[PDB]
């Protein structure tokens, strides 16, 4: 949710 994931 708040967790960041880089889409690239």
């Amino acid at each position, epitope marked *: 949710d708040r967790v960041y*994931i*880089h*889409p*690239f």
Partner: antibody
Amino acid sequence: QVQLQESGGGLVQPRGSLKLSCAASGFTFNTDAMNWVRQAPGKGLEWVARIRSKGFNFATYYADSVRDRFTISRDDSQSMLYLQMNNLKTEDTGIYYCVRGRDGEAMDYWGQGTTLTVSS
Amino acid sequence: DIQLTQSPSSLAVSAGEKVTMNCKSSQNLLHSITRKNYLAWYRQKPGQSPKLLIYWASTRGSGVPDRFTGSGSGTDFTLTISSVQAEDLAVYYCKQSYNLYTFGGGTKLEIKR
């Protein structure tokens, strides 16, 4: 080794279509994001398309150049990373490597890279 | 947007030497809520697909030998190689993954012999 059998591509006339078919195997395809990178004979590399996994509703990012013309697409069950080229120009001529690359990491595995030619 | 510039474009060296490349970014690549420098380094052997060498600016890819050491943060990232084996001949590129991708011009490594 994790392979990436990339059938498709060859000589095509300008304004014509085409649709490559990257079929990888060796890792868990449905869970990883894929990409398509091209290389104009001689020059460097150029990222062209990206389709994020099911987890992110098959999100897609297209480089500016191929925008509104190319359509990356996948089919998890058959491990098929497709790409629909339309309104081909002379520039699009080149090698189209198909590579898998997990979110936020690196372009882990590059395939062989089929050829594509656009000419009258 | 992100425009990568390498230097030197061409470099010649003899077997067994410390070669240093260089990649300079237009916009910062260090991500705030990740503290990672999304900048990778790939090499392409003549007549082969690009092979990954370094990611996150310093982390080495699986199976990549010790010879290759990525370095840098922000915008001035450097690729460094020690004991350049003959086999090291290929073109070296630096891509960016901060916001989409923008491969670098490249750097051809020729072997003086």
